[PDB]
Design a protein around this ligand. Structure first.
Ligand SMILES: Nc1ncnc2c1ncn2[C@@H]1O[C@H](COP(=O)(O)OP(=O)(O)OP(=O)(O)O)[C@@H](O)[C@H]1O
Ligand SMILES: Nc1ncnc2c1ncn2[C@@H]1O[C@H](COP(=O)(O)OP(=O)(O)O)[C@@H](O)[C@H]1O
Lengths: 433, 829, 224
């Protein structure tokens, strides 16, 4: 498997590379190999801290690093064929950076935010400044420490430098703000305990869970405006799904109460309910994978209250003023385009020429994960205003879920001056609904 | 003596074996073409009186290649010496302007294709030059110029195959000079450039390239386009389970012997066995040719010589239901690349300028966000596509509508209405009724004003009137009882002109079979061309039966259903090619057989065989699928073909009632005769019921309020009612035959048929339910009906037979209380 | 070692495995006094058994089985040791974990100590609490101490628990007991040592990593 921590993969990378290849002059090659190796290690650990490290869990295997080594070899060999030294400025930094960001480590990258964050790291590392003795590979920890790039010119020094790395590694080496472990190990430790601790009626079960659901989910009541049509469609879907699921659950209750009715579909539904798994028949709006029936019922209660409020307000048109919950809707991209169309009609611009501005349409419920501020100066959301207008900032995603699986809503926020914008991509910032 | 080009751009040899001949001819022609195009390269202002002649003198691939070579030479020379770069930009801009003005006027055949090709090529060249100029480059050999597809020519090169060379980022290829044909040129977008970069890397590394991502984003198209850009003939194979380890080995043997480019559509259903064996084979050949670069290879336990020009390419669509994972030892042998969003705005801009629209930039910048808005807005149906395929189809529709309007009339033609007319042609049909109010309104907010009203082929309308009256079907013209259905028929006629491949979709009882039948017959009448159809049920036979099978021990491919129908078609011994020939599929969807068609419902309409035999669809052929719903279809299936949504309201209740009455009146049960006479009489009796609300529609709609043991569908129970009323007529016929001197008169037949029809509705509708539900339908029938009914206060209406005298009789008259034999108390029967 | 099968489907081991392990740790012991030989082999059996077991195990449990070897280096502390398996200012989770840890007498005073030790409050926010643990709990040995530190980190900062467990393995078997894994597996040496003929060499790979590329290099290495 890929190893744990940066040091392990760095040592394995040096082991894999034959000494007869890396040793050949110009000496610059050796340093660049180390640089490449270091970068690979960060990637090889960022995957372990998804989704913050990478929104999509791409694989970066042996062949990627092998093609990387071939690319570096080709570039340096053709740069100064026959010489014994290349100046720091004469390395084709931009060329290798492009071949890195687009093909080798970007070939499997699809979401442009990840492709943006690969280019950010490549700009951070592959530069002339790498050959400066004061160059820092990254920040070591929050306590005012930095990993100083080794000043040697041989693997016989770089390998030793890698061995002498500190034991107390944290994700801050990777640019993440040392929080994945706070869940990851926090699970594994408990799992560890369980492992050594492992080394040394259907109807009643369903009825206990289904008795109180009717007291949880309330009951819903049902011209050419771009806003009033979409919300009518959405509340129609809400009422349909509400009646379907509630009828199914009540029929399961009657089965448990003893009024026969044990049909095939009801039998399967009971078998799924007792296990606590979400019935696949009800997956009419995207949810986190493996979500439980209890979480589903809570989300359904909240959605029912949301749609009840929406119907009561719309009946009273006024959908520019009535609040919304992005992500709380079933197809929020439809709502976003509905706002686009409403602004286009209300003042008679064309839709293609519009673009969004945001600040703190009134939409609530969002939360900025990986940053915080109160003046549109993001630093490394009780109410939000959105507007559409014709024609030191960071382009962020906004995902419906808490697993960063579905890009739904792109935003451009303004960062505070003292923060490098690059740090906003290494920190894996985004907004969740 | 020459080459008979399919398109018409013929080729004549310089010395009138074959492969060398065509290569030499194309190479010498290319040398002459570049020697001629350097004039326009250096010309300050280009006169069309020489430019169009130069275009006409040579072929599409040749003229594009010559323009590319000259532009690359000019840019490299300008960088070697921002004055000269601005001069090259001005030259290419002038060429683009004269070409874009030339395309406005009509042109002979085989030329406008070349003009479109050169429009695409020149806008690509201008884009590269402008990007280079803005990010100013002073060094000739900087990477930002080295990384683009550069072309070099040296006439000093004695042998006539190697003068042209292509150079890319750390790469040097030689153009194939194999005859590629016209086809079409793809717009150069950033992701196509990324594909070229990585594919070139892999080819220099003796590997293969593996584009992947959502289906329908130019993976196979990018592969084949780059193959054309290197002069290498591209073979696309329709991979699926039918391909065993020996078949793929034979394919690799052929590839290595000929040195062609092996394009593969979907490495996701070869099964792990024939996937791992292929992994072994590709690793073997890759290592062999790596040794060659610094040879014979053991293909299927046979040493075969292998050319350096061969290559492997693996398209895939990971993430979909009908797909399988891969071994890692295979995946390490292919340089992967993810494609998810080809830049549509630039594509639309270049295509519209290729057609020559006045405001092509504005049309593209409007049409692309229109697609995005509509995709984000409309309901999440199971067959809505708005991806790249829909954009290409609507753009080609816009081009054809421009041509039609020009022929109707020239330089002041409105073009927004053309776009609206194309969108309504190809995008409106797939919509559900609830999605009509949104989409049109969206078109109001992307194209304000420019209101459009559809034409009409009234000749087809009258022919449809004639056949629809012939087949005892009701006919309308847009708003009458027969309006919606015939309107959908004209919609299908419009769609079959574009999408060679189509899906009629909707719930059962919509009229899809009737729709395409009436359209085939009407087109046959209108154009006087035999409209021939072949109906196939996919699941009713095995997939192997559907497509056929290869014996494992010799070359004998037993044809299946679809393959045999095709082989008969392209054989055309009976002049089948001179007939409107349709293959109609009727069943349900399963990827296991659907995605084997993915290479014949797509721009490159062609499927392959395990033997390597290739079958293309002739132009007249159309493929059509009649389907209920699309619950189990990948995005590829939806994107491959156009849609027609036959909602449940395409046939009103009165429509089927009138069809039943017409069939009753016209054709007899045995084929005014006696049977016909009683049929017409009975139709007269029940005429106030088989129409509008009446009683039959009321009962039919009431039937869906009651519980059933199976799914109540309107058309099932209504066919039941029709059949048992046919039996009512047969009963009257038997009664008349029973009295050869006292035939039934109107005063008896009226009572008989009225009571029979009431009983028929009441039973046929509630034909499968519990006793209480049948009683409930009886109560409904009592409430609505006008016929007299039994006066028993508590006997259900279902408990009465209709006497041949036309009088109700309780069933208790037919249940004798008998005493069976003691010999046979409970014996069988 | 045979009880490992409860955790995974790959954790299948034979008696020949242990026979080979003991045969090599005996004949190939790094040493000539009898007591010296016995002490050295007592350490070497643990070391070689851990190495051989965990070179064919996934990383998430490389600590796990290792610590169970430290279960059988114990004088004995079972009564308080088996608590953290029984049960599974401050936060709710920390509060309940601490109250459950208070069942044992040794930490019975924590209810007062955490109230008095403000430096403990600061240590709760330490970046590396395992490296510096306060002792809020009548002799005490290094191993008993390390067990107490494991229990404390479980109660308070379980996020770093896996780290502190390593130190416990160091407290009994050595700091270098685990350091043999953070390196590339020298396939030539292990193949020449442990793999006799008739022993099939299984290379199992987590998805996304191919093992074959290693062995081919070995085939290139040995010129075989
Ligand atoms: N426009 C029409 N006018 C009158 N009768 C019609 C019309 N369209 C269809 N019908 C009748 O409706 C019945 C069902 O239509 P059709 O035979 O076309 O089925 P279909 O399209 O194959 O149905 P399915 O979707 O259930 O597979 C047939 O009796 C057909 O004659
Ligand atoms: N750059 C482009 N401009 C216009 N249309 C394109 C472009 N690239 C691809 N297309 C269209 O996209 C479709 C999908 O091509 P393909 O890669 O074969 O799909 P798949 O391989 O997923 O079946 C083709 O029909 C092609 O016409």
């Amino acid at each position: 498997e890929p190893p744990p921590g940066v040091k392990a993969n760095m040592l394995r990378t040096f082991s894999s590379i034959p000494v007869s290849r890396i040793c050949k002059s110009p000496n610059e090659r050796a340093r660049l190999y180390f640089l490449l190796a270091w970068f690979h290690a960060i990637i090889q650990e960022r995957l372990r801290y998804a989704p913050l490290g990478w929104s999509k869990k791409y694989e970066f295997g042996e062949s990627d690093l092998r093609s990387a080594c071939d690319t570096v070899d080709t570039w340096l060999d053709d740069t100064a064929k026959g010489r014994q030294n290349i100046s720091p400025d004469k390395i084709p930094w931009s060329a290798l950076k492009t071949l890195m960001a687009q093909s080798i480590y970007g070939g499997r990258v699809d979401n442009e935010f990840d492709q943006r964050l690969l280019n950010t790291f490549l700009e951070r590392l592959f530069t002339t400044r790498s050959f400066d003795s004061e160059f820092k590979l990254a920040c070591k920890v929050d306590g005012h420490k930095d990993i100083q790039m080794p000043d040697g010119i041989r693997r016989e020094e770089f390998v030793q430098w890698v061995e002498l790395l500190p034991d107390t590694q944290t994700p801050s080496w990777l640019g993440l703000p040392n929080n994945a472990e706070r869940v990851l190990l926090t699970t594994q430790g408990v799992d560890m305990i369980s492992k050594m601790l492992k080394m040394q009626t259907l109807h009643t079960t369903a009825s206990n869970w289904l008795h109180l659901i009717p007291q949880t989910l309330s009951h819903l009541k049902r011209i050419k405006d771009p806003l009033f049509r979409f919300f009518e469609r959405e509340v129609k879907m809400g009422a349909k799904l509400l009646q379907d699921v509630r009828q199914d659950l009540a029929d399961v209750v009657q089965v448990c109460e003893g009024k026969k009715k044990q049909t095939n579909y009801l039998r399967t539904l009971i078998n799924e309910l007792v296990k606590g798994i979400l019935p696949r028949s009800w997956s009419h709006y995207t949810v986190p994978a493996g979500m439980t029936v209890i979480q589903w019922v809570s989300d359904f209660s909240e959605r029912i209250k949301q749609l009840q409020n929406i119907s009561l307000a719309a009946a009273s048109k006024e959908l520019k003023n009535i609040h919304v919950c992005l992500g709380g809707l079933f197809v929020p991209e439809a709502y976003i385009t509905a706002t686009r169309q409403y602004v286009a009609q209300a003042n008679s611009w064309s839709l293609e020429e519009l673009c969004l501005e945001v600040n703190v349409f009134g939409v609530t419920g969002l939360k900025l994960q990986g940053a915080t501020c109160n003046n549109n100066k993001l630093s490394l959301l009780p109410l939000t205003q959105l507007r559409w207008v014709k024609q030191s900032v960071v382009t962020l995603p906004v995902y419906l879920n808490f697993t960063r699986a579905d890009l739904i809503f792109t935003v451009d926020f303004e960062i505070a001056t003292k923060e490098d914008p690059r740090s906003f991509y290494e920190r894996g910032v985004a907004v969740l609904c | 003596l020459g080459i008979s080009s399919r398109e018409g751009e013929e080729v004549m040899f310089k010395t009138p074996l074959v492969e060398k001949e065509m290569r030499v001819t194309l190479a010498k022609l290319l040398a002459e073409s570049v020697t001629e195009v350097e004039i326009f390269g250096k010309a300050t202002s280009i006169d069309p009186n020489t430019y169009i002649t130069w275009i006409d003198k040579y072929q599409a691939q040749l003229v594009v290649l010559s323009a590319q070579i000259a532009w690359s030479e000019n840019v490299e020379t300008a960088l070697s010496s921002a004055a000269p770069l601005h001069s090259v930009l001005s030259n290419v801009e002038v060429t683009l302007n004269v070409l874009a003005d030339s395309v406005l006027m009509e042109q002979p055949p085989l030329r406008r294709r070349k003009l479109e090709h050169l429009i695409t090529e020149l806008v690509h060249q201008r884009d590269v030059t402008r990007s280079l100029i803005k990010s100013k480059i002073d060094n000739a050999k900087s990477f930002e110029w080295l990384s683009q597809m550069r072309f070099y020519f040296d006439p000093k090169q004695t042998d006539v195959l190697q003068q042209l060379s292509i150079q890319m980022a750390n790469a040097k290829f030689n153009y194939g000079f194999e005859y590629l044909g016209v086809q079409d040129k793809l717009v150069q977008t950033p992701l196509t450039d990324r594909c070229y970069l990585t594919m070139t890397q892999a080819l220099e590394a003796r590997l293969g390239g593996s584009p992947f991502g959502p289906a329908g984003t130019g993976k196979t198209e990018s592969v084949k386009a780059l193959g054309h850009q290197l002069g290498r003939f591209v073979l696309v194979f329709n991979c699926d389970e039918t391909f065993d380890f020996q078949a793929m080995g034979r394919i690799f043997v052929g590839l290595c012997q000929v040195g062609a480019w092996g394009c593969f559509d979907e490495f996701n259903r070869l099964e792990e066995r024939m996937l791992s064996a292929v992994s072994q084979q590709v690793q073997c050949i890759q290592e062999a040719l790596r040794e060659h670069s610094n040879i014979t290879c053991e293909l299927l336990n046979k040493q075969v010589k292998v050319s350096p020009d061969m290559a492997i390419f693996i398209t895939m669509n990971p993430g979909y239901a009908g797909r399988s994972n891969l071994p890692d030892n295979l995946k390490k042998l292919f340089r992967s690349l993810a494609m998810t969003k080809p830049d549509r705005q630039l594509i639309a801009q270049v295509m519209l300028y290729s057609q020559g629209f006045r405001t092509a930039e504005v049309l593209a910048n409007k049409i692309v966000p229109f697609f995005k808005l509509c995709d984000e807005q409309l309901s999440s149906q199971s067959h809505y596509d708005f991806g790249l395929r829909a954009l290409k189809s609507v753009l080609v529709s816009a081009g054809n509508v421009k041509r039609e309007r020009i022929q109707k009339i020239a330089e002041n033609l409105p073009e927004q209405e053309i776009l609206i007319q194309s969108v309504c042609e190809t995008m409106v049909p797939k919509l559900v009724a609830e999605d009509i109010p949104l989409l049109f309104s969206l078109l109001s907010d992307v194209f304000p004003g420019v209101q459009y009203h559809r034409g009409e082929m009234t000749a087809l309308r009258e022919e449809l009137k004639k056949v629809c009256q012939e087949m005892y079907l009701t006919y309308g013209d847009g708003e009458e009882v027969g309006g919606m259905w015939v309107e959908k028929v004209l919609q299908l006629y419009q769609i079959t002109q574009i999408n060679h491949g189509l899906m009629m979709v909707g719930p059962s009882g919509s009229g899809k079979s009737m729709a395409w039948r009436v359209l085939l017959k009407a087109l046959e009448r209108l154009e006087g061309v035999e409209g021939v159809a072949h109906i196939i049920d996919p699941k009713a036979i095995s997939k192997d039966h559907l497509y056929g099978t290869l014996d494992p021990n010799t070359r004998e491919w037993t044809d299946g259903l679809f393959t045999h129908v095709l082989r008969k078609i392209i054989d055309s011994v009976r002049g089948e090619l001179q007939k409107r020939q349709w293959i109609v599929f009727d069943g349900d969807v399963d990827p296991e057989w659907v995605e084997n068609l993915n290479s014949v419902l797509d721009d490159n309409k062609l499927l392959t065989l395990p033997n390597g035999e290739r079958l293309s669809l002739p132009p007249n052929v159309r493929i059509m699928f009649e389907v209920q719903d699309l619950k189990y279809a990948t995005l590829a299936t939806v994107s491959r073909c156009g849609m027609v949504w036959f909602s449940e309201d395409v046939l009103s209740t009165d429509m089927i009632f009138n069809n039943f009455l017409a069939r009753l009146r016209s054709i007899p049960l045995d084929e005014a005769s006696p049977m016909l006479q009683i049929q017409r009489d009975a139709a007269t009796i029940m005429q106030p019921y088989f129409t509008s609300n009446g009683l039959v529609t009321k009962a039919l709609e009431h039937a869906f309020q009651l519980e059933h043991i199976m799914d109540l569908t309107r058309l099932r129970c209504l066919g039941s009612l029709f059949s048992m009323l046919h039996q009512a007529c047969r009963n009257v016929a038997q009664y008349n035959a029973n009295h050869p001197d006292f035939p039934m008169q109107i005063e008896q037949l009226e009572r008989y048929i009225q009571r029979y029809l009431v009983y028929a509705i009441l039973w046929s509708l509630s034909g499968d339910s519990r006793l209480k539900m049948r009683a409930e339908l009886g109560e409904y029938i009592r409430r609505i009906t006008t016929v007299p009914l039994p006066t028993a206060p508590n006997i259900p209406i279902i408990d009465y037979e209709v006497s041949i005298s036309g009088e109700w009789s309780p069933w208790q008259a037919k249940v004798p209380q008998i005493e069976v034999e003691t010999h046979k108390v409970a014996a069988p029967d | 070692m045979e009880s490992l099968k409860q955790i995974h489907f790959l954790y299948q081991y034979s008696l020949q495995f242990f026979l080979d392990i003991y045969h090599n740790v005996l004949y190939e012991n790094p040493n000539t006094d009898h007591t010296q030989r016995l002490s050295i082999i007592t350490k070497d059996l643990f070391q070689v058994a851990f190495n051989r077991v965990a070179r064919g195990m996934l990383h998430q449990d490389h600590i796990t089985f290792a610590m169970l070897l430290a279960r059988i280096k114990l004088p004995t502390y079972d009564a308080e040791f088996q608590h953290f398996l029984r049960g599974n200012g401050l936060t709710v989770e920390q509060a309940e974990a601490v109250v459950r840890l208070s069942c044992l007498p040794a930490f019975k005073d924590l209810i007062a100590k955490v109230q008095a030790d403000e430096q403990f409050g600061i240590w709760l926010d330490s970046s590396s609490p395992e490296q510096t643990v306060p002792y809020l709990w009548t002799p005490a040995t290094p191993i008993g101490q390390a067990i107490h530190r494991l229990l404390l980190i479980q109660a308070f900062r379980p996020d770093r628990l896996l780290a502190m467990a390593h130190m416990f393995v160091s407290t009994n078997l050595g700091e270098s007991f685990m350091s043999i894994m953070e390196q590339p597996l020298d396939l030539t040496h292990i193949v020449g040592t442990e793999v006799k003929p008739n022993t099939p060499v299984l290379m199992c790979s987590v998805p996304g990593y191919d093992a074959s590329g290693h062995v081919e290099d070995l085939a290139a290495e040995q010129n075989t």
